[PDB]
Amino acid sequence: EETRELQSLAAAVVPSAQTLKITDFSFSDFELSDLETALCTIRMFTDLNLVQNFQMKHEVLCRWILSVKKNYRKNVAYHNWRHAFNTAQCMFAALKAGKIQNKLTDLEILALLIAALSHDLDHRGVNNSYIQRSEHPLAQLYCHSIMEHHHFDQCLMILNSPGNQILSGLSIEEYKTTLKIIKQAILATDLALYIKRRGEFFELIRKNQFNLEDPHQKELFLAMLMTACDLSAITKPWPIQQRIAELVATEFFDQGDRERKELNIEPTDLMNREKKNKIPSMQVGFIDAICLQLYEALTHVSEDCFPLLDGCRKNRQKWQALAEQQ
Ligand SMILES: COc1ccc(-c2oc3c(CCC(C)C)c(O)cc(O)c3c(=O)c2O[C@@H]2O[C@@H](C)[C@H](O)[C@@H](O)[C@H]2O)cc1
Ligand SMILES: [Mg+2]
Ligand SMILES: [Zn+2]
């Protein structure tokens, strides 16, 4: 049944953040049941003071979380509920352990958590923005569909569904503002927009010009933070990192098989199952081109986010070792 879920969740005792280990950057969701990931999510909203400050009724928050989880597809190897959940957990860790919570307003935090959980809702296993030839230093290409996505639209649909209105406690103006931030946060998770706007952020950081209170720069930082959390699987302790990387590869190969049948074209190497041997070199190219500079830059705003950079570095070394073939 579909309510046996709400029934169990609404009545369950929500363990502390410490007990749930959600404050750790090295957090793993693998050992948790779906119910436990929902409890972890309730704790995130609670410890960031969102339930209290925004007058969220318990049953409403529970129904919303379940609705979000239900709208992801378990048959998609990587971009599913566990990815969204991990993205939100990383956001929680960055806000708490990284001390980013005091740098932002409660409305921004509310928007970020909702965005983290909802950003990949319109994912059917079709990756429309990625890097081709990452293993080729001088020939890497960033590709993206000419058409756009409806991730925000799905997020809005759930937020406005009867019984799921976790934003009903906001004022008319607060509601409008918050929706704008959520939309921008979700759009920011598209690699295309990240690649497009990161230069400005890196330059500000390099020149010690980053100003939290400049609205334009605040927006830019929130977009960068979203990407940092979205890509955080790449920073986990090696064994966790590799398990997640296998999922990403599986999804990519499944896409290549599908586009082969639907478009009669051979997939780029990234989505070609027969090119598995090249994975380590591809992982290294991706980390160098997209991840390392972002995690380095984040440490300049939040020194305590160092674990993300540290993990990214360690994993690059291990992937590189494999590329050279141990
Ligand atoms: C385990 O943590 C990971 C995080 C991201 C990735 C990842 O790898 C990539 C690799 C490495 C080779 C592989 C066989 C994986 C490429 O060669 C080219 C890419 O564009 C990506 C990529 O976009 C990507 O990011 C993931 O997919 C992209 C599509 C998403 O936008 C992003 O959020 C994330 O989920 C892999 C592992
Ligand atoms: Mg995605
Ligand atoms: Zn994502």
Side-chain angles (χ1 to χ4, degrees), residues 78-79 127 129-131 134 191 230-231 233-234 241 244-245 248-249 252 270 282-283 286:
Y78 181 71
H79 296 101
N127 296 281
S129 294
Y130 64 98
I131 298 173
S134 69
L191 280 182
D230 185 37
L231 298 173
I234 198 72
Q241 141 72 189
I244 297 170
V248 180
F252 284 175
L270 177 60
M282 294 177 169
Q283 286 284 348
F286 177 69

mmCIF file with all atom_site columns, all heavy atoms in Angstrom, residues 78-79 127 129-131 134 191 230-231 233-234 241 244-245 248-249 252 270 282-283 286, ligand 1:
data_model
loop_
_atom_site.group_PDB
_atom_site.id
_atom_site.type_symbol
_atom_site.label_atom_id
_atom_site.label_alt_id
_atom_site.label_comp_id
_atom_site.label_asym_id
_atom_site.label_entity_id
_atom_site.label_seq_id
_atom_site.pdbx_PDB_ins_code
_atom_site.Cartn_x
_atom_site.Cartn_y
_atom_site.Cartn_z
_atom_site.occupancy
_atom_site.B_iso_or_equiv
_atom_site.pdbx_formal_charge
_atom_site.auth_seq_id
_atom_site.auth_comp_id
_atom_site.auth_asym_id
_atom_site.auth_atom_id
_atom_site.pdbx_PDB_model_num
ATOM   1   N N   . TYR A 1 78  ? 21.546 5.349  -10.676 1.00 0.00 ? 78  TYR A N   1
ATOM   2   C CA  . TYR A 1 78  ? 22.138 6.330  -9.782  1.00 0.00 ? 78  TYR A CA  1
ATOM   3   C C   . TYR A 1 78  ? 21.284 7.554  -9.468  1.00 0.00 ? 78  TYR A C   1
ATOM   4   O O   . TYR A 1 78  ? 21.107 7.909  -8.301  1.00 0.00 ? 78  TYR A O   1
ATOM   5   C CB  . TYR A 1 78  ? 23.492 6.796  -10.324 1.00 0.00 ? 78  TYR A CB  1
ATOM   6   C CG  . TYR A 1 78  ? 24.139 7.786  -9.399  1.00 0.00 ? 78  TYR A CG  1
ATOM   7   C CD1 . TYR A 1 78  ? 24.655 7.378  -8.173  1.00 0.00 ? 78  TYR A CD1 1
ATOM   8   C CD2 . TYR A 1 78  ? 24.128 9.151  -9.692  1.00 0.00 ? 78  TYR A CD2 1
ATOM   9   C CE1 . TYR A 1 78  ? 25.110 8.301  -7.244  1.00 0.00 ? 78  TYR A CE1 1
ATOM   10  C CE2 . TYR A 1 78  ? 24.585 10.090 -8.766  1.00 0.00 ? 78  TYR A CE2 1
ATOM   11  C CZ  . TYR A 1 78  ? 25.067 9.653  -7.539  1.00 0.00 ? 78  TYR A CZ  1
ATOM   12  O OH  . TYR A 1 78  ? 25.500 10.561 -6.605  1.00 0.00 ? 78  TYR A OH  1
ATOM   13  N N   . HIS A 1 79  ? 20.750 8.210  -10.489 1.00 0.00 ? 79  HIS A N   1
ATOM   14  C CA  . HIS A 1 79  ? 19.935 9.400  -10.221 1.00 0.00 ? 79  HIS A CA  1
ATOM   15  C C   . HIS A 1 79  ? 18.534 9.027  -9.773  1.00 0.00 ? 79  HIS A C   1
ATOM   16  O O   . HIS A 1 79  ? 17.575 9.105  -10.539 1.00 0.00 ? 79  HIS A O   1
ATOM   17  C CB  . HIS A 1 79  ? 19.909 10.306 -11.447 1.00 0.00 ? 79  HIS A CB  1
ATOM   18  C CG  . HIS A 1 79  ? 21.253 10.860 -11.787 1.00 0.00 ? 79  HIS A CG  1
ATOM   19  N ND1 . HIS A 1 79  ? 22.034 10.353 -12.802 1.00 0.00 ? 79  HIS A ND1 1
ATOM   20  C CD2 . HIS A 1 79  ? 22.000 11.810 -11.178 1.00 0.00 ? 79  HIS A CD2 1
ATOM   21  C CE1 . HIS A 1 79  ? 23.204 10.964 -12.800 1.00 0.00 ? 79  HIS A CE1 1
ATOM   22  N NE2 . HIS A 1 79  ? 23.211 11.852 -11.824 1.00 0.00 ? 79  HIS A NE2 1
ATOM   23  N N   . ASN A 1 127 ? 20.695 11.335 -19.032 1.00 0.00 ? 127 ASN A N   1
ATOM   24  C CA  . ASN A 1 127 ? 21.609 12.399 -18.646 1.00 0.00 ? 127 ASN A CA  1
ATOM   25  C C   . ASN A 1 127 ? 21.771 13.309 -19.860 1.00 0.00 ? 127 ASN A C   1
ATOM   26  O O   . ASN A 1 127 ? 22.357 12.923 -20.872 1.00 0.00 ? 127 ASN A O   1
ATOM   27  C CB  . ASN A 1 127 ? 22.934 11.783 -18.201 1.00 0.00 ? 127 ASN A CB  1
ATOM   28  C CG  . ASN A 1 127 ? 22.766 10.916 -16.958 1.00 0.00 ? 127 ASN A CG  1
ATOM   29  O OD1 . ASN A 1 127 ? 22.685 11.424 -15.841 1.00 0.00 ? 127 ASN A OD1 1
ATOM   30  N ND2 . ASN A 1 127 ? 22.671 9.610  -17.152 1.00 0.00 ? 127 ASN A ND2 1
ATOM   31  N N   . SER A 1 129 ? 23.237 16.386 -19.778 1.00 0.00 ? 129 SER A N   1
ATOM   32  C CA  . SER A 1 129 ? 24.352 17.304 -19.618 1.00 0.00 ? 129 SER A CA  1
ATOM   33  C C   . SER A 1 129 ? 25.510 16.537 -19.031 1.00 0.00 ? 129 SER A C   1
ATOM   34  O O   . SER A 1 129 ? 25.444 16.083 -17.891 1.00 0.00 ? 129 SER A O   1
ATOM   35  C CB  . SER A 1 129 ? 23.979 18.449 -18.683 1.00 0.00 ? 129 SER A CB  1
ATOM   36  O OG  . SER A 1 129 ? 22.977 19.255 -19.267 1.00 0.00 ? 129 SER A OG  1
ATOM   37  N N   . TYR A 1 130 ? 26.573 16.385 -19.811 1.00 0.00 ? 130 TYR A N   1
ATOM   38  C CA  . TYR A 1 130 ? 27.731 15.656 -19.328 1.00 0.00 ? 130 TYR A CA  1
ATOM   39  C C   . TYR A 1 130 ? 28.962 15.988 -20.157 1.00 0.00 ? 130 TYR A C   1
ATOM   40  O O   . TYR A 1 130 ? 28.901 16.805 -21.077 1.00 0.00 ? 130 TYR A O   1
ATOM   41  C CB  . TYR A 1 130 ? 27.467 14.152 -19.371 1.00 0.00 ? 130 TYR A CB  1
ATOM   42  C CG  . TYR A 1 130 ? 27.274 13.628 -20.767 1.00 0.00 ? 130 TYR A CG  1
ATOM   43  C CD1 . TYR A 1 130 ? 28.328 13.030 -21.449 1.00 0.00 ? 130 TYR A CD1 1
ATOM   44  C CD2 . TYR A 1 130 ? 26.059 13.777 -21.428 1.00 0.00 ? 130 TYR A CD2 1
ATOM   45  C CE1 . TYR A 1 130 ? 28.185 12.600 -22.756 1.00 0.00 ? 130 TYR A CE1 1
ATOM   46  C CE2 . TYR A 1 130 ? 25.902 13.346 -22.745 1.00 0.00 ? 130 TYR A CE2 1
ATOM   47  C CZ  . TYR A 1 130 ? 26.974 12.761 -23.399 1.00 0.00 ? 130 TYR A CZ  1
ATOM   48  O OH  . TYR A 1 130 ? 26.845 12.333 -24.697 1.00 0.00 ? 130 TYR A OH  1
ATOM   49  N N   . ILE A 1 131 ? 30.068 15.333 -19.824 1.00 0.00 ? 131 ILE A N   1
ATOM   50  C CA  . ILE A 1 131 ? 31.333 15.551 -20.507 1.00 0.00 ? 131 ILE A CA  1
ATOM   51  C C   . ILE A 1 131 ? 31.759 14.365 -21.361 1.00 0.00 ? 131 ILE A C   1
ATOM   52  O O   . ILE A 1 131 ? 31.854 13.240 -20.878 1.00 0.00 ? 131 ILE A O   1
ATOM   53  C CB  . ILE A 1 131 ? 32.448 15.834 -19.486 1.00 0.00 ? 131 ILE A CB  1
ATOM   54  C CG1 . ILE A 1 131 ? 32.111 17.111 -18.715 1.00 0.00 ? 131 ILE A CG1 1
ATOM   55  C CG2 . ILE A 1 131 ? 33.799 15.934 -20.194 1.00 0.00 ? 131 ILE A CG2 1
ATOM   56  C CD1 . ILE A 1 131 ? 33.041 17.399 -17.578 1.00 0.00 ? 131 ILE A CD1 1
ATOM   57  N N   . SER A 1 134 ? 36.364 12.837 -21.424 1.00 0.00 ? 134 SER A N   1
ATOM   58  C CA  . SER A 1 134 ? 37.018 13.412 -20.252 1.00 0.00 ? 134 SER A CA  1
ATOM   59  C C   . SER A 1 134 ? 38.455 12.927 -20.117 1.00 0.00 ? 134 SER A C   1
ATOM   60  O O   . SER A 1 134 ? 39.303 13.633 -19.567 1.00 0.00 ? 134 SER A O   1
ATOM   61  C CB  . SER A 1 134 ? 36.254 13.064 -18.965 1.00 0.00 ? 134 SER A CB  1
ATOM   62  O OG  . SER A 1 134 ? 36.362 11.685 -18.668 1.00 0.00 ? 134 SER A OG  1
ATOM   63  N N   . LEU A 1 191 ? 25.059 20.716 -15.057 1.00 0.00 ? 191 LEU A N   1
ATOM   64  C CA  . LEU A 1 191 ? 26.486 20.975 -15.254 1.00 0.00 ? 191 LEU A CA  1
ATOM   65  C C   . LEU A 1 191 ? 26.770 22.171 -16.157 1.00 0.00 ? 191 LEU A C   1
ATOM   66  O O   . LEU A 1 191 ? 27.746 22.890 -15.949 1.00 0.00 ? 191 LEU A O   1
ATOM   67  C CB  . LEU A 1 191 ? 27.190 19.740 -15.818 1.00 0.00 ? 191 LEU A CB  1
ATOM   68  C CG  . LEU A 1 191 ? 27.544 18.640 -14.816 1.00 0.00 ? 191 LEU A CG  1
ATOM   69  C CD1 . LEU A 1 191 ? 28.291 17.517 -15.533 1.00 0.00 ? 191 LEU A CD1 1
ATOM   70  C CD2 . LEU A 1 191 ? 28.402 19.224 -13.695 1.00 0.00 ? 191 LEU A CD2 1
ATOM   71  N N   . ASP A 1 230 ? 25.706 18.155 -4.952  1.00 0.00 ? 230 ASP A N   1
ATOM   72  C CA  . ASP A 1 230 ? 25.265 17.240 -6.011  1.00 0.00 ? 230 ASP A CA  1
ATOM   73  C C   . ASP A 1 230 ? 26.392 16.271 -6.413  1.00 0.00 ? 230 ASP A C   1
ATOM   74  O O   . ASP A 1 230 ? 26.150 15.082 -6.627  1.00 0.00 ? 230 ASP A O   1
ATOM   75  C CB  . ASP A 1 230 ? 24.786 18.074 -7.219  1.00 0.00 ? 230 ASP A CB  1
ATOM   76  C CG  . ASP A 1 230 ? 24.186 17.229 -8.357  1.00 0.00 ? 230 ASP A CG  1
ATOM   77  O OD1 . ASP A 1 230 ? 23.489 16.227 -8.100  1.00 0.00 ? 230 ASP A OD1 1
ATOM   78  O OD2 . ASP A 1 230 ? 24.393 17.601 -9.531  1.00 0.00 ? 230 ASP A OD2 1
ATOM   79  N N   . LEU A 1 231 ? 27.622 16.773 -6.478  1.00 0.00 ? 231 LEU A N   1
ATOM   80  C CA  . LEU A 1 231 ? 28.774 15.952 -6.874  1.00 0.00 ? 231 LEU A CA  1
ATOM   81  C C   . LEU A 1 231 ? 29.514 15.270 -5.724  1.00 0.00 ? 231 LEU A C   1
ATOM   82  O O   . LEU A 1 231 ? 30.462 14.514 -5.967  1.00 0.00 ? 231 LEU A O   1
ATOM   83  C CB  . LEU A 1 231 ? 29.793 16.819 -7.625  1.00 0.00 ? 231 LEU A CB  1
ATOM   84  C CG  . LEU A 1 231 ? 29.352 17.479 -8.931  1.00 0.00 ? 231 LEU A CG  1
ATOM   85  C CD1 . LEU A 1 231 ? 30.443 18.416 -9.418  1.00 0.00 ? 231 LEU A CD1 1
ATOM   86  C CD2 . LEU A 1 231 ? 29.049 16.401 -9.969  1.00 0.00 ? 231 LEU A CD2 1
ATOM   87  N N   . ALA A 1 233 ? 29.341 12.685 -4.002  1.00 0.00 ? 233 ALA A N   1
ATOM   88  C CA  . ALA A 1 233 ? 29.600 11.249 -3.975  1.00 0.00 ? 233 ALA A CA  1
ATOM   89  C C   . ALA A 1 233 ? 31.074 11.007 -4.352  1.00 0.00 ? 233 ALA A C   1
ATOM   90  O O   . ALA A 1 233 ? 31.707 10.053 -3.890  1.00 0.00 ? 233 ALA A O   1
ATOM   91  C CB  . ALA A 1 233 ? 28.697 10.540 -4.964  1.00 0.00 ? 233 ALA A CB  1
ATOM   92  N N   . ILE A 1 234 ? 31.615 11.888 -5.189  1.00 0.00 ? 234 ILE A N   1
ATOM   93  C CA  . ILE A 1 234 ? 32.997 11.773 -5.656  1.00 0.00 ? 234 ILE A CA  1
ATOM   94  C C   . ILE A 1 234 ? 34.029 12.013 -4.552  1.00 0.00 ? 234 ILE A C   1
ATOM   95  O O   . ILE A 1 234 ? 35.209 11.713 -4.740  1.00 0.00 ? 234 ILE A O   1
ATOM   96  C CB  . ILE A 1 234 ? 33.279 12.769 -6.833  1.00 0.00 ? 234 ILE A CB  1
ATOM   97  C CG1 . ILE A 1 234 ? 34.531 12.351 -7.606  1.00 0.00 ? 234 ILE A CG1 1
ATOM   98  C CG2 . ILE A 1 234 ? 33.539 14.170 -6.290  1.00 0.00 ? 234 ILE A CG2 1
ATOM   99  C CD1 . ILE A 1 234 ? 34.354 11.116 -8.452  1.00 0.00 ? 234 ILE A CD1 1
ATOM   100 N N   . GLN A 1 241 ? 32.833 5.592  -2.377  1.00 0.00 ? 241 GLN A N   1
ATOM   101 C CA  . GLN A 1 241 ? 33.021 6.297  -3.640  1.00 0.00 ? 241 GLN A CA  1
ATOM   102 C C   . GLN A 1 241 ? 32.924 5.343  -4.824  1.00 0.00 ? 241 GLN A C   1
ATOM   103 O O   . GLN A 1 241 ? 32.192 5.593  -5.783  1.00 0.00 ? 241 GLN A O   1
ATOM   104 C CB  . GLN A 1 241 ? 34.403 6.967  -3.659  1.00 0.00 ? 241 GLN A CB  1
ATOM   105 C CG  . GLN A 1 241 ? 35.123 6.911  -5.024  1.00 0.00 ? 241 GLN A CG  1
ATOM   106 C CD  . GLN A 1 241 ? 34.479 7.830  -6.022  1.00 0.00 ? 241 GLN A CD  1
ATOM   107 O OE1 . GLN A 1 241 ? 34.796 7.820  -7.216  1.00 0.00 ? 241 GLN A OE1 1
ATOM   108 N NE2 . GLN A 1 241 ? 33.554 8.646  -5.532  1.00 0.00 ? 241 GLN A NE2 1
ATOM   109 N N   . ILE A 1 244 ? 29.414 3.892  -5.503  1.00 0.00 ? 244 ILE A N   1
ATOM   110 C CA  . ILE A 1 244 ? 28.560 4.892  -6.134  1.00 0.00 ? 244 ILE A CA  1
ATOM   111 C C   . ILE A 1 244 ? 28.972 5.123  -7.589  1.00 0.00 ? 244 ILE A C   1
ATOM   112 O O   . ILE A 1 244 ? 28.119 5.284  -8.459  1.00 0.00 ? 244 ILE A O   1
ATOM   113 C CB  . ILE A 1 244 ? 28.633 6.233  -5.353  1.00 0.00 ? 244 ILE A CB  1
ATOM   114 C CG1 . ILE A 1 244 ? 28.090 6.038  -3.938  1.00 0.00 ? 244 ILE A CG1 1
ATOM   115 C CG2 . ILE A 1 244 ? 27.782 7.262  -6.051  1.00 0.00 ? 244 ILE A CG2 1
ATOM   116 C CD1 . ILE A 1 244 ? 28.334 7.233  -3.028  1.00 0.00 ? 244 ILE A CD1 1
ATOM   117 N N   . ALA A 1 245 ? 30.278 5.099  -7.853  1.00 0.00 ? 245 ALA A N   1
ATOM   118 C CA  . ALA A 1 245 ? 30.781 5.286  -9.214  1.00 0.00 ? 245 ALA A CA  1
ATOM   119 C C   . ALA A 1 245 ? 30.328 4.153  -10.136 1.00 0.00 ? 245 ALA A C   1
ATOM   120 O O   . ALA A 1 245 ? 30.107 4.370  -11.330 1.00 0.00 ? 245 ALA A O   1
ATOM   121 C CB  . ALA A 1 245 ? 32.306 5.385  -9.201  1.00 0.00 ? 245 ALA A CB  1
ATOM   122 N N   . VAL A 1 248 ? 26.869 5.022  -11.243 1.00 0.00 ? 248 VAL A N   1
ATOM   123 C CA  . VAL A 1 248 ? 26.873 6.061  -12.272 1.00 0.00 ? 248 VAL A CA  1
ATOM   124 C C   . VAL A 1 248 ? 27.216 5.449  -13.632 1.00 0.00 ? 248 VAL A C   1
ATOM   125 O O   . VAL A 1 248 ? 26.553 5.728  -14.638 1.00 0.00 ? 248 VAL A O   1
ATOM   126 C CB  . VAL A 1 248 ? 27.902 7.179  -11.961 1.00 0.00 ? 248 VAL A CB  1
ATOM   127 C CG1 . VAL A 1 248 ? 27.858 8.246  -13.063 1.00 0.00 ? 248 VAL A CG1 1
ATOM   128 C CG2 . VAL A 1 248 ? 27.606 7.813  -10.599 1.00 0.00 ? 248 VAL A CG2 1
ATOM   129 N N   . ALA A 1 249 ? 28.255 4.621  -13.661 1.00 0.00 ? 249 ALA A N   1
ATOM   130 C CA  . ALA A 1 249 ? 28.677 3.972  -14.896 1.00 0.00 ? 249 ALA A CA  1
ATOM   131 C C   . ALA A 1 249 ? 27.556 3.098  -15.453 1.00 0.00 ? 249 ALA A C   1
ATOM   132 O O   . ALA A 1 249 ? 27.268 3.119  -16.648 1.00 0.00 ? 249 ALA A O   1
ATOM   133 C CB  . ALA A 1 249 ? 29.943 3.126  -14.641 1.00 0.00 ? 249 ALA A CB  1
ATOM   134 N N   . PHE A 1 252 ? 25.048 5.193  -17.101 1.00 0.00 ? 252 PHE A N   1
ATOM   135 C CA  . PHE A 1 252 ? 25.564 5.724  -18.355 1.00 0.00 ? 252 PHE A CA  1
ATOM   136 C C   . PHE A 1 252 ? 25.510 4.649  -19.438 1.00 0.00 ? 252 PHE A C   1
ATOM   137 O O   . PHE A 1 252 ? 25.102 4.921  -20.567 1.00 0.00 ? 252 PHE A O   1
ATOM   138 C CB  . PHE A 1 252 ? 27.007 6.220  -18.178 1.00 0.00 ? 252 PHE A CB  1
ATOM   139 C CG  . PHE A 1 252 ? 27.122 7.547  -17.453 1.00 0.00 ? 252 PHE A CG  1
ATOM   140 C CD1 . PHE A 1 252 ? 28.371 8.062  -17.128 1.00 0.00 ? 252 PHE A CD1 1
ATOM   141 C CD2 . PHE A 1 252 ? 25.995 8.288  -17.125 1.00 0.00 ? 252 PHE A CD2 1
ATOM   142 C CE1 . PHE A 1 252 ? 28.500 9.296  -16.494 1.00 0.00 ? 252 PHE A CE1 1
ATOM   143 C CE2 . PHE A 1 252 ? 26.114 9.532  -16.485 1.00 0.00 ? 252 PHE A CE2 1
ATOM   144 C CZ  . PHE A 1 252 ? 27.370 10.031 -16.172 1.00 0.00 ? 252 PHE A CZ  1
ATOM   145 N N   . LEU A 1 270 ? 31.887 7.146  -23.081 1.00 0.00 ? 270 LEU A N   1
ATOM   146 C CA  . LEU A 1 270 ? 31.365 7.233  -21.720 1.00 0.00 ? 270 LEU A CA  1
ATOM   147 C C   . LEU A 1 270 ? 30.150 6.342  -21.486 1.00 0.00 ? 270 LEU A C   1
ATOM   148 O O   . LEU A 1 270 ? 29.964 5.794  -20.395 1.00 0.00 ? 270 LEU A O   1
ATOM   149 C CB  . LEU A 1 270 ? 30.980 8.680  -21.405 1.00 0.00 ? 270 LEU A CB  1
ATOM   150 C CG  . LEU A 1 270 ? 30.354 8.940  -20.031 1.00 0.00 ? 270 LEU A CG  1
ATOM   151 C CD1 . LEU A 1 270 ? 31.330 8.539  -18.944 1.00 0.00 ? 270 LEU A CD1 1
ATOM   152 C CD2 . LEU A 1 270 ? 29.990 10.423 -19.898 1.00 0.00 ? 270 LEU A CD2 1
ATOM   153 N N   . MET A 1 282 ? 38.742 8.079  -17.184 1.00 0.00 ? 282 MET A N   1
ATOM   154 C CA  . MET A 1 282 ? 37.592 8.969  -17.344 1.00 0.00 ? 282 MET A CA  1
ATOM   155 C C   . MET A 1 282 ? 37.258 9.637  -16.011 1.00 0.00 ? 282 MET A C   1
ATOM   156 O O   . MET A 1 282 ? 36.912 10.823 -15.966 1.00 0.00 ? 282 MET A O   1
ATOM   157 C CB  . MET A 1 282 ? 36.372 8.187  -17.841 1.00 0.00 ? 282 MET A CB  1
ATOM   158 C CG  . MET A 1 282 ? 36.512 7.614  -19.239 1.00 0.00 ? 282 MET A CG  1
ATOM   159 S SD  . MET A 1 282 ? 35.055 6.655  -19.663 1.00 0.00 ? 282 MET A SD  1
ATOM   160 C CE  . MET A 1 282 ? 35.281 6.385  -21.415 1.00 0.00 ? 282 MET A CE  1
ATOM   161 N N   . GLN A 1 283 ? 37.353 8.875  -14.925 1.00 0.00 ? 283 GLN A N   1
ATOM   162 C CA  . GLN A 1 283 ? 37.068 9.423  -13.601 1.00 0.00 ? 283 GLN A CA  1
ATOM   163 C C   . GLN A 1 283 ? 38.097 10.495 -13.264 1.00 0.00 ? 283 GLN A C   1
ATOM   164 O O   . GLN A 1 283 ? 37.758 11.542 -12.710 1.00 0.00 ? 283 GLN A O   1
ATOM   165 C CB  . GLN A 1 283 ? 37.091 8.318  -12.540 1.00 0.00 ? 283 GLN A CB  1
ATOM   166 C CG  . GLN A 1 283 ? 35.874 7.396  -12.565 1.00 0.00 ? 283 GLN A CG  1
ATOM   167 C CD  . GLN A 1 283 ? 34.628 8.033  -11.968 1.00 0.00 ? 283 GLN A CD  1
ATOM   168 O OE1 . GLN A 1 283 ? 34.694 9.081  -11.320 1.00 0.00 ? 283 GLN A OE1 1
ATOM   169 N NE2 . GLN A 1 283 ? 33.489 7.394  -12.167 1.00 0.00 ? 283 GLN A NE2 1
ATOM   170 N N   . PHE A 1 286 ? 37.395 13.665 -15.242 1.00 0.00 ? 286 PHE A N   1
ATOM   171 C CA  . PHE A 1 286 ? 36.227 14.352 -14.722 1.00 0.00 ? 286 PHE A CA  1
ATOM   172 C C   . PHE A 1 286 ? 36.574 15.117 -13.446 1.00 0.00 ? 286 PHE A C   1
ATOM   173 O O   . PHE A 1 286 ? 36.212 16.287 -13.286 1.00 0.00 ? 286 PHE A O   1
ATOM   174 C CB  . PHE A 1 286 ? 35.104 13.358 -14.432 1.00 0.00 ? 286 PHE A CB  1
ATOM   175 C CG  . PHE A 1 286 ? 33.896 13.997 -13.827 1.00 0.00 ? 286 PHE A CG  1
ATOM   176 C CD1 . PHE A 1 286 ? 33.102 14.856 -14.582 1.00 0.00 ? 286 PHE A CD1 1
ATOM   177 C CD2 . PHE A 1 286 ? 33.584 13.791 -12.489 1.00 0.00 ? 286 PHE A CD2 1
ATOM   178 C CE1 . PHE A 1 286 ? 32.012 15.506 -14.005 1.00 0.00 ? 286 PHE A CE1 1
ATOM   179 C CE2 . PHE A 1 286 ? 32.501 14.431 -11.904 1.00 0.00 ? 286 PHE A CE2 1
ATOM   180 C CZ  . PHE A 1 286 ? 31.714 15.292 -12.662 1.00 0.00 ? 286 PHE A CZ  1
HETATM 181 C C1  . LIG B 2 .   ? 30.962 8.644  -7.407  1.00 0.00 ? 1   LIG B C1  1
HETATM 182 O O1  . LIG B 2 .   ? 30.749 10.064 -7.506  1.00 0.00 ? 1   LIG B O1  1
HETATM 183 C C2  . LIG B 2 .   ? 30.665 10.448 -8.842  1.00 0.00 ? 1   LIG B C2  1
HETATM 184 C C3  . LIG B 2 .   ? 30.121 11.701 -9.156  1.00 0.00 ? 1   LIG B C3  1
HETATM 185 C C4  . LIG B 2 .   ? 30.038 12.114 -10.497 1.00 0.00 ? 1   LIG B C4  1
HETATM 186 C C5  . LIG B 2 .   ? 30.489 11.282 -11.526 1.00 0.00 ? 1   LIG B C5  1
HETATM 187 C C6  . LIG B 2 .   ? 30.464 11.653 -12.873 1.00 0.00 ? 1   LIG B C6  1
HETATM 188 O O2  . LIG B 2 .   ? 31.398 11.051 -13.702 1.00 0.00 ? 1   LIG B O2  1
HETATM 189 C C7  . LIG B 2 .   ? 31.577 11.453 -15.004 1.00 0.00 ? 1   LIG B C7  1
HETATM 190 C C8  . LIG B 2 .   ? 32.545 10.830 -15.776 1.00 0.00 ? 1   LIG B C8  1
HETATM 191 C C9  . LIG B 2 .   ? 33.399 9.733  -15.170 1.00 0.00 ? 1   LIG B C9  1
HETATM 192 C C10 . LIG B 2 .   ? 33.263 8.372  -15.853 1.00 0.00 ? 1   LIG B C10 1
HETATM 193 C C11 . LIG B 2 .   ? 32.272 7.485  -15.462 1.00 0.00 ? 1   LIG B C11 1
HETATM 194 C C12 . LIG B 2 .   ? 32.152 6.127  -16.152 1.00 0.00 ? 1   LIG B C12 1
HETATM 195 C C13 . LIG B 2 .   ? 31.299 7.857  -14.339 1.00 0.00 ? 1   LIG B C13 1
HETATM 196 C C14 . LIG B 2 .   ? 32.726 11.204 -17.099 1.00 0.00 ? 1   LIG B C14 1
HETATM 197 O O3  . LIG B 2 .   ? 33.711 10.604 -17.846 1.00 0.00 ? 1   LIG B O3  1
HETATM 198 C C15 . LIG B 2 .   ? 31.948 12.224 -17.646 1.00 0.00 ? 1   LIG B C15 1
HETATM 199 C C16 . LIG B 2 .   ? 30.977 12.863 -16.866 1.00 0.00 ? 1   LIG B C16 1
HETATM 200 O O4  . LIG B 2 .   ? 30.221 13.872 -17.407 1.00 0.00 ? 1   LIG B O4  1
HETATM 201 C C17 . LIG B 2 .   ? 30.785 12.474 -15.539 1.00 0.00 ? 1   LIG B C17 1
HETATM 202 C C18 . LIG B 2 .   ? 29.808 13.089 -14.744 1.00 0.00 ? 1   LIG B C18 1
HETATM 203 O O5  . LIG B 2 .   ? 29.104 13.975 -15.214 1.00 0.00 ? 1   LIG B O5  1
HETATM 204 C C19 . LIG B 2 .   ? 29.635 12.694 -13.396 1.00 0.00 ? 1   LIG B C19 1
HETATM 205 O O6  . LIG B 2 .   ? 28.696 13.372 -12.614 1.00 0.00 ? 1   LIG B O6  1
HETATM 206 C C20 . LIG B 2 .   ? 27.503 12.621 -12.358 1.00 0.00 ? 1   LIG B C20 1
HETATM 207 O O7  . LIG B 2 .   ? 26.685 12.552 -13.542 1.00 0.00 ? 1   LIG B O7  1
HETATM 208 C C21 . LIG B 2 .   ? 26.295 13.849 -14.056 1.00 0.00 ? 1   LIG B C21 1
HETATM 209 C C22 . LIG B 2 .   ? 25.437 13.649 -15.322 1.00 0.00 ? 1   LIG B C22 1
HETATM 210 C C23 . LIG B 2 .   ? 25.473 14.608 -13.009 1.00 0.00 ? 1   LIG B C23 1
HETATM 211 O O8  . LIG B 2 .   ? 25.154 15.906 -13.494 1.00 0.00 ? 1   LIG B O8  1
HETATM 212 C C24 . LIG B 2 .   ? 26.270 14.727 -11.711 1.00 0.00 ? 1   LIG B C24 1
HETATM 213 O O9  . LIG B 2 .   ? 25.477 15.357 -10.716 1.00 0.00 ? 1   LIG B O9  1
HETATM 214 C C25 . LIG B 2 .   ? 26.733 13.342 -11.229 1.00 0.00 ? 1   LIG B C25 1
HETATM 215 O O10 . LIG B 2 .   ? 25.616 12.569 -10.810 1.00 0.00 ? 1   LIG B O10 1
HETATM 216 C C26 . LIG B 2 .   ? 31.014 10.031 -11.184 1.00 0.00 ? 1   LIG B C26 1
HETATM 217 C C27 . LIG B 2 .   ? 31.103 9.610  -9.862  1.00 0.00 ? 1   LIG B C27 1
#
